[PDB]
Every structure is written in structure tokens, then in C-alpha cells.
């Protein structure tokens, strides 16, 4: 496929890793009784291993010669779930955190002792501001156009 890689559903090394991993867990399983609690734990880990390998091969992950999923972050639309889509999700969360904390610092900057509300959190004020990050890309963008995001001459 891309960069000489082969999809994990086609790679033999990928399937050999799944085999050897499951057979290694089965080798640990023979030591215990079929009704034992370690047996149900190892069986659950085996089922969890099958689920993991199957999910990786199903969602179009590319594999190298090592049989391990390689990620393609160039922006190719076949693999946006590998970086761009989770990255946009992160930037939404990160902007939320920064915008809410910024709203908090602005609200307490006019207090008599602003340091008091920085080492002892005003939870009521925080709880009222935590949901402004939901619309942070909008409130930030408007503050960009209105000259409210950046302090003048610093």
C-alpha cells in the first residue's frame, strides 16, 4: 500500500503475532484447572487479544514487515482516524481547558487578593465557567476579531 506497507489483514507477520500471543497465553492456561479463576482470567485475556487484533485489521491499519500497525499522519483520507480526527478531538479538549482556566483568571483578577482564589479554588465560579469551553472555538474567535484575546502593547 502506502510507503511499501501492507494492510494488517493481509500481513502474515500480523497473524503470526496473534497466533504466538494466544498460544503463549494458552501455554500459561494449561497449568490451571478449567473451572479456576486464573483460567477465566487467562481466557478473558485471550478473547481480549482476539478482539484487539481483529479491530486493528478491520479498520484498515497498515502493517510493516514487523507485523505491527504503522500510522500514517500525512493526511491521507484513508487513515484520518489515526491522527487528524483524534487530533481535532484533542485540540477541542485542550482549547476547552485553556479557555476555562483563562476565564477563571480573568474573573478573579479584580479580587482584593487574587492570589487567594488561586490557592483556594472558587468552586462555584469554576462550575459556572467549566461549560463555557463547550463553545470555546466561537468565544475565542469572536474575542480575536474584537481585540479581547490579546493584551494591547505587551
Amino acid at each position: 500500500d502506502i510507503a511499501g506497507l501492507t494492510p494488517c489483514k493481509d500481513s502474515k507477520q500480523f497473524a503470526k503475532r496473534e497466533k504466538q500471543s494466544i498460544k503463549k497465553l494458552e501455554s500459561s492456561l494449561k497449568l490451571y484447572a478449567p473451572d479456576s479463576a486464573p483460567a477465566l482470567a487467562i481466557n478473558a485475556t485471550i478473547e481480549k487479544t482476539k478482539r484487539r487484533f481483529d479491530n486493528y485489521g478491520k479498520q484498515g491499519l497498515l502493517c510493516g514487515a514487523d507485523g505491527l500497525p504503522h500510522l500514517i499522519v500525512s493526511g491521507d483520507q484513508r487513515h484520518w482516524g489515526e491522527f487528524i480526527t483524534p487530533g481535532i478531538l484533542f485540540l477541542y479538549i485542550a482549547g476547552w481547558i485553556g479557555w476555562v482556566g483563562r476565564s477563571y483568571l480573568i474573573a478573579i483578577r479584580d479580587d482584593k487578593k487574587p492570589t487567594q482564589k488561586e490557592i483556594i479554588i472558587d468552586v462555584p465560579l469554576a462550575t459556572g465557567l467549566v461549560f463555557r469551553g463547550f463553545s470555546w472555538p466561537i468565544a475565542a474567535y469572536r474575542e480575536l476579531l474584537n481585540g479581547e484575546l490579546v493584551a494591547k502593547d505587551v
Binding site: 461549560f131 463555557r132 463547550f134 463553545s135 466561537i138 468565544a139 469572536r142 474584537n146 479581547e148
Partner: protein, 198 residues
């Protein structure tokens, strides 16, 4: 007393009540700046108007199809159909026309009353109205743009925007269209709910 979205909560100060559809609803404080309020009023009008036309064009052709009067493709399948022009050509036509119209409306948003006249024909201009409510040829039937009338426009736009939000999310999880969802629900509401769909 202008209508309370939450009977307990008080109305924000910057929401005076001189705006149609005002119910004191802005928990996140997005329109605290009057310029943000001025821009978002136009954004609500245009989003509400497009949602009203969209919900109509999505629901009404489909119910008339399911009844049996006409056979019109569904709103999500109407794009895959074949038309007299290439979809790419349709895109470029729509882009050019809106790249002219929306920017002419945008010039009025920034500077009011600056695009009321026709640049091709010097006469035939628009009378002076308010931003978001252009008079003249845009109101041929000469209705009265007043309260209630403007409040009903915003109210229908809000419900239609929620209606569009329902249509897209329903069609995603249910597979079929809005009127088919209503028929499936009407047959047995206690066993055909979003609880059962998931």
C-alpha cells in the same frame, strides 16, 4: 416579564428584551459583547431560515412520496441521483451565485444601508429597513415586519434548526428518513423509541 427560558434564573443584563424571541437564554455568555450579539442575531436568522427551507424540502417531498401522490427521492439519496448537469457544475454555479449574494448581505451587516441599490440599474433601490430584514423587492406582498411576526420567524427557525438536528442524527442511527421514523414510532411508541433503536 418578557418570557423566561428558566422560570427561576434571571435574565442577563445585555439581553434587554428589544429583540424578538428574547427569553433571557445565554448561559455561556456568548453575546455579552453587543457586537457579538449583533453578529449572532444575523447568524440565527440565516441559520433558522436555511433550516426552515431544509426541513421542508426534506420532510414534505418524503411524506408525499410515502403517501403515494409523488415519487421523489429521499433527502439523503437525492444527491446520488442523476440530473441534467454534472454535480460539479451545479457546485460551481451555487458557489458563484452565493459568493455574490452572501457578500452583498455581508456588506450590509458591517455597514448598514450600503448595498440597497442595484449597481446595474441605478434606479430600483431598496427602501431603508433593518439588518436581516431587507425591504423592497424582497417583500413583494408588502406584509408588516413587526413583533410577533418577527418573533414567529425566529421561533419557527429555532424549531426547524432543532428539526434539522433531529433529521441528521436520526437518519444516521435509524437508516431511514424522518417520516419513516414517525410511522415506525406511531405504530408502537412504547416499543419503537430511541431506547429501542440503539
Amino acid at each position: 416579564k418578557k418570557g423566561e427560558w428558566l422560570p427561576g434564573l434571571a435574565s442577563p443584563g445585555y439581553l434587554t428584551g428589544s429583540l424578538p424571541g428574547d427569553n433571557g437564554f445565554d448561559p455561556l455568555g456568548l453575546a455579552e459583547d453587543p457586537e457579538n450579539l449583533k453578529w449572532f442575531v444575523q447568524a440565527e436568522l440565516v441559520n433558522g431560515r436555511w433550516a426552515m427551507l431544509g426541513v421542508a424540502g426534506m420532510l414534505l417531498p418524503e411524506v408525499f412520496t410515502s403517501i403515494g401522490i409523488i415519487n421523489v427521492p429521499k433527502w439523503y439519496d437525492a444527491g446520488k441521483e442523476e440530473y441534467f448537469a454534472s454535480s460539479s457544475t451545479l457546485f460551481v454555479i451555487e458557489f458563484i451565485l452565493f459568493h455574490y449574494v452572501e457578500i452583498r448581505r455581508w456588506q450590509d451587516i458591517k455597514n448598514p444601508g450600503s448595498v440597497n441599490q442595484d449597481p446595474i440599474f441605478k434606479q430600483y433601490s431598496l427602501p431603508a429597513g433593518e439588518v436581516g430584514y431587507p425591504g423592497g423587492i424582497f417583500n413583494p406582498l408588502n406584509f408588516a415586519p413587526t413583533l410577533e411576526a418577527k418573533e414567529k420567524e425566529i421561533a419557527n427557525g429555532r424549531l426547524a434548526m432543532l428539526a434539522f438536528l433531529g433529521f441528521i442524527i436520526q437518519h444516521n442511527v435509524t437508516g431511514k428518513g424522518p417520516f419513516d421514523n414517525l410511522l415506525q414510532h406511531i405504530s408502537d411508541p412504547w416499543h419503537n423509541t430511541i431506547v429501542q433503536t440503539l
